Design a protein around this nucleic acid. Structure first.
Lengths: 147, 210, 102
RNA sequence: UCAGUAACGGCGAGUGAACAGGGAAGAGCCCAGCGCCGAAUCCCCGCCCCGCGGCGGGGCGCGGGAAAUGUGGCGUACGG
RNA sequence: CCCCCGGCGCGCCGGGCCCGGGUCUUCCCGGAGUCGGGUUGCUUGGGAAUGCAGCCCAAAGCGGGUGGUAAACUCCAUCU
RNA sequence: GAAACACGGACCAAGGAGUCUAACACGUGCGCGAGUCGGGGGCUACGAAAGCCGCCGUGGCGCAAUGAAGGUGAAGGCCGGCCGGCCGAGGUGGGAUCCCGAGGCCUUCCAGUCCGCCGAGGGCGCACCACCGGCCCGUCUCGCCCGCCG
């Protein structure tokens, strides 16, 4: 909506909001990211530290599908299954633990960030973290690996 | 000239991009032309399915996707061999065939052979000439119920197997998952160097005895 | 000691029973036929050997296998082709010496 | 969509794909060679019939030519 | 409503038309100044050279190509 | 520093200059909310619109970081004999608001209750700020121990 823009208010003011001394010229500092090392040195070192230089090894033909490993924390581990399972597990007196297969839900690794409710589980995952295992055992569950 | 704080932007607009801008104003016209051509094709092959031939069940490569199942290009030749279908007849009854596929597993092979059995049973075959119903052709009455099928024929639904709640035993209670991951990760890493030093250790025993 | 199928290790991967079938007929290409062999050695009788092959065999009679291979390698190209070409030229050098003895 | 990514680059300015995945569409095939069949093949002229504004079909010609320095049928890596 | 264009089957005549599948045994099977190597120049995101071309070298047949870092050895995979 | 012996301008009419696209940032409005989004594709005059499709959310961004990389990947305390029970998600200071209430709120006089109001003081303390601990990844130093198919 041009009727709301600033140019509608600048009609009649000579310099059009760019000053009389320092006219609005074409490219007073160079085009694009020019002078990153010479006359824009301060800006690049104050707001983009680490911009210039090489670091690390090169991986020529990178396929993102090999390093694919979505993770899930223990705090929302119980959100993968329906609530009916979570309440029938505590209601159950046999002690049968429900099975929570994360790779079916879409995750591979299980990280132990949160606290777990005190009732056993059987977590089927592809990988585990050390804390994630230690928390599952403490609740009384079991860590089942799959491939 | 960068202002106070922002990103270092690299817009790829240094060529003559304005001469090669593809606008999409024909998009609604293309969607219409596609649909009309799709319906015109369905009327041309009226009793046959609109989607086309059946595709096989297929895993995905690239560990990101191997838990899912697609529709392949066509059935492999050994899937047709076990299903008792000549490879030059399957296209004539609507069975996609591609000779490039191999079968490394048996369940993928058996899942598609089981799929062709389910299709060959659901197939209403018309006689070559209505005057003389031949052998493999359908009985006269179900030709009256043969109508065009819409959507992908026998759609591939990626289904899971639910597991009943079990009581945890002691071995799976005492299984050290993280330790076994780090251990097995190290065994694969130090497998070649260990086999070398162990073979090397045979070099000095023969020198020590003799 | 339960064994779970892991995603890492010497034998990682989803456990699936493999089926063996006779390999594709295209895998068979390059295999020597007893009739094709009868042709390539028949032409050997007619055509002969290339000048670099004769020169290599000269290096082989005086037992200069290292120099003979370095020579062939600079001619034919890679080291794999050079190696195979060497033992083929020496089998011809042995087969003619055996026939010369008899 | 991957992705302004892996990578390239006075590694500066800048440049920059692919696989997988989801769709549109979907269709596969033929020789040479290797061999079998009596060249079993093709072009053209003359006659007969049929149509003859896409000169074609059939027949008859000890009619001419091409072709054994390879025509045709079978058959092509999914094997034959 | 009236013309024109092809469509769609039906029937007649003149034609070519004998053809497949399975098991078993016995035989057969492949594209060269090309691949590849060196080098030069261009090109590429392709980085001890992605592609292309010139010049020189110049193949093999359980071989050959590919397997994104040059090389040897050794297993696999994958195409032809 | 211009009335300038600075430059442009004889006069009139009409035309005549911060735009669009992409990216990014912050602010703001709206919808939904640990989700969100069909933009691509399908399905059913104005209409090339609108509606629909989640077994069309593939995918994007977000929900986890860190290391060059191999990789790893986000509280603890007590009791009992390394195991068994219990308590189990930091603290300090300042904090808008709420809470308690020592008391105290007139017609003929006292006794005299309910409601409402006020208030010394005392509390739970939002957001946020300052600080102190804690946890994850990299790295360094110092060590003691554990575990098992090889």
């Amino acid at each position: 909506p041009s009727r709301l823009r600033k140019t509608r208010k600048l009609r009649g003011h000579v310099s059009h909001g760019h000053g009389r001394i320092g006219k609005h010229r074409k490219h007073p500092g160079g085009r694009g990211n020019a002078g990153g090392m010479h006359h824009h040195r301060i800006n690049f070192d104050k707001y983009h530290p680490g911009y210039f230089g090489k670091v690390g090894m090169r991986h020529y033909h990178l396929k993102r599908n090999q390093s694919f490993c979505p993770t899930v924390n223990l705090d929302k581990l119980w959100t993968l299954v329906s609530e009916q399972t979570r309440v029938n597990a505590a209601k159950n007196k046999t002690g049968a633990a429900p099975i929570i297969d994360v790779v079916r839900s879409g995750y591979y690794k299980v990280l132990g960030k949160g606290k777990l409710p005190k009732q056993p589980v059987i977590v089927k995952a592809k990988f585990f973290s050390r804390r994630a295992e230690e928390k599952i055992k403490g609740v009384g569950g079991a860590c089942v690996l799959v491939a | 000239a960068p202002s106070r704080n922002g990103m270092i932007l690299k817009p790829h607009f240094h060529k003559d991009w304005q001469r090669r801008v593809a606008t999409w104003f024909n998009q609604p016209a293309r969607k219409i032309r596609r649909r009309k051509a799709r319906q015109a094709r369905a009327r041309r092959i009226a009793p046959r399915p609109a989607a086309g031939p059946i595709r096989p069940i297929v895993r995905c490569p690239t560990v990101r996707y191997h838990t899912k199942v697609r529709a392949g290009r066509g059935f492999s030749l050994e899937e047709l061999r076990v299903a008792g279908i000549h490879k030059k007849v399957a296209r004539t009854i609507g069975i996609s065939v591609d000779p490039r596929r191999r079968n490394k597993s048996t369940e993928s092979l058996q899942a598609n052979v089981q799929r062709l059995k389910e299709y060959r049973s659901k197939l209403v075959l018309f006689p070559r000439k209505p005057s003389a119903p031949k052998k493999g052709d359908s009985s006269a009455e179900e030709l009256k119920l043969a109508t065009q099928l819409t959507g992908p024929v026998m759609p591939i639904r990626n289904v899971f197997k639910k597991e009943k709640a079990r009581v945890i035993t002691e071995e799976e209670k005492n299984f050290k998952a993280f330790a076994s991951l780090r251990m097995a990760r190290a065994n694969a890493r130090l497998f070649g160097i260990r086999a070398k030093r162990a073979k090397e250790a045979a070099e000095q025993d023969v020198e020590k005895k003799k | 000691a339960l064994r779970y199928p892991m995603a890492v290790g010497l034998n990682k991967g989803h456990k699936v029973t493999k089926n063996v079938s006779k390999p594709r007929h295209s895998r068979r290409r390059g295999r020597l036929t007893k009739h094709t062999k009868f042709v390539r050695d028949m032409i050997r009788e007619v055509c002969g050997f290339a000048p670099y092959e004769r020169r290599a065999m000269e290096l082989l009679k005086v037992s200069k296998d290292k120099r003979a291979l370095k020579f062939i390698k600079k001619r034919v190209g890679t080291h794999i082709r050079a190696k195979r070409k060497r033992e083929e030229l020496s089998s011809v050098l042995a087969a003619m010496r055996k026939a010369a003895a008899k």
